[PDB]
Amino acid sequence: TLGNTTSSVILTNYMDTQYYGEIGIGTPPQTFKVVFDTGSSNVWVPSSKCSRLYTACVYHKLFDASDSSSYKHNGTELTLRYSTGTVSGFLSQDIITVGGITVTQMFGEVTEMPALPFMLAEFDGVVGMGFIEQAIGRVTPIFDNIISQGVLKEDVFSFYYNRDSQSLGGQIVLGGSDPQHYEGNFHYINLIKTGVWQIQMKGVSVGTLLCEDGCLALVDTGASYISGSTSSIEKLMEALGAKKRLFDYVVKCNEGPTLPDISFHLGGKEYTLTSADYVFQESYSSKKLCTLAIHAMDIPPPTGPTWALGATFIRKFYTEFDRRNNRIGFALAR
Numbered sequence: 001t002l003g004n005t006t007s008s009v010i011l012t013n014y015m016d017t018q019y020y021g022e023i024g025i026g027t028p029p030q031t032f033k034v035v036f037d038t039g040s041s042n043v044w045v046p047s048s049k050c051s052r053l054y055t056a057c058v059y060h061k062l063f064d065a066s067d068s069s070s071y072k073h074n075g076t077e078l079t080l081r082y083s084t085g086t087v088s089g090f091l092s093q094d095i096i097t098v099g100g101i102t103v104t105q106m107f108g109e110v111t112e113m114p115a116l117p118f119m120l121a122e123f124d125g126v127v128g129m130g131f132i133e134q135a136i137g138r139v140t141p142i143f144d145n146i147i148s149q150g151v152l153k154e155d156v157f158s159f160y161y162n163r164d165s166q167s168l169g170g171q172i173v174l175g176g177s178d179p180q181h182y183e184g185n186f187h188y189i190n191l192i193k194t195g196v197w198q199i200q201m202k203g204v205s206v207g208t209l210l211c212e213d214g215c216l217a218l219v220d221t222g223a224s225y226i227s228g229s230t231s232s233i234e235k236l237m238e239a240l241g242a243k244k245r246l247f248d249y250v251v252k253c254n255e256g257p258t259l260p261d262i263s264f265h266l267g268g269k270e271y272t273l274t275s276a277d278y279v280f281q282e283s284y285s286s287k288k289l290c291t292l293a294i295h296a297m298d299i300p301p302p303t304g305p306t307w308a309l310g311a312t313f314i315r316k317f318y319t320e321f322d323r324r325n326n327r328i329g330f331a332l333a334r
């Protein structure tokens, strides 16, 4: 079942690492800054029931069930595990607005929210855009719920991530794509399987050094960076002349623009990033260090080992997520 509505969510670009939009939960709406994340499937926001001893709950918007006349209790415990951290809490049901679409949605009220990393979040919560199969507690994801309404023109959603300074930080179209933010044709790659926004990758090139037998690529709107496995990144970085630090790889800022192209071989086409697309050029000095927007992340089975194509990739390539045809479309962003 399909309608005729298309709907956009305006996103704020925080330091090229966090892309978030506004959603409203409850009656009247309590507003939250949320990351729309294709790598997970649960909605959560911090709870008023979160102990103030969690400092992250002091520094973020808290959902207060006691102020919502449309709240429906459930209370089942849930733990959501991400790459960079974990949240715990319980399930609740309420009205959620996103792009002027209202859905009754089960979501997590988070009562346990670690200061690292959640103090470093501009956003309050997460809206998972993954499939029900990856949803913790088998809770229906928000998009599946929007699909049930039969209002969207297509069973698709699209991401645009900008660079950044008083302009559009990003955009999610629910029900289509926006031609004003892409050019040329979409080139589609089918998913490995329905359930995960993951596709076959045929190779990674520096300047084909890596993934020469084929590997996996998670198209992850909630990942800031392009990530590969530890040994894959170690080899990638050796070729770039980049040195390892605790959380990132750095190159000396001067040698930044001279860094080779990195190409990802997806569904026939070759998706190339220049150094400008993956280096945080904050200086041109030899005596300063510059961070690369490519990280090591060992994603566990059964999803892993896999590469993750995050904001670094999506900035260059406007991404359409097709649920009806179980594929991902890429076009040149503008």
Ligand SMILES: *[C@@H]1O[C@H](CO)[C@@H](O)[C@H](O)[C@H]1NC(C)=O
Residues within 6 Å of the ligand: 073, 074, 075, 076
């Ligand atoms: C929570 O939701 C599940 C599944 O919809 C349901 O079976 C259960 O009874 C609910 N629990 C409470 C306490 O509302």
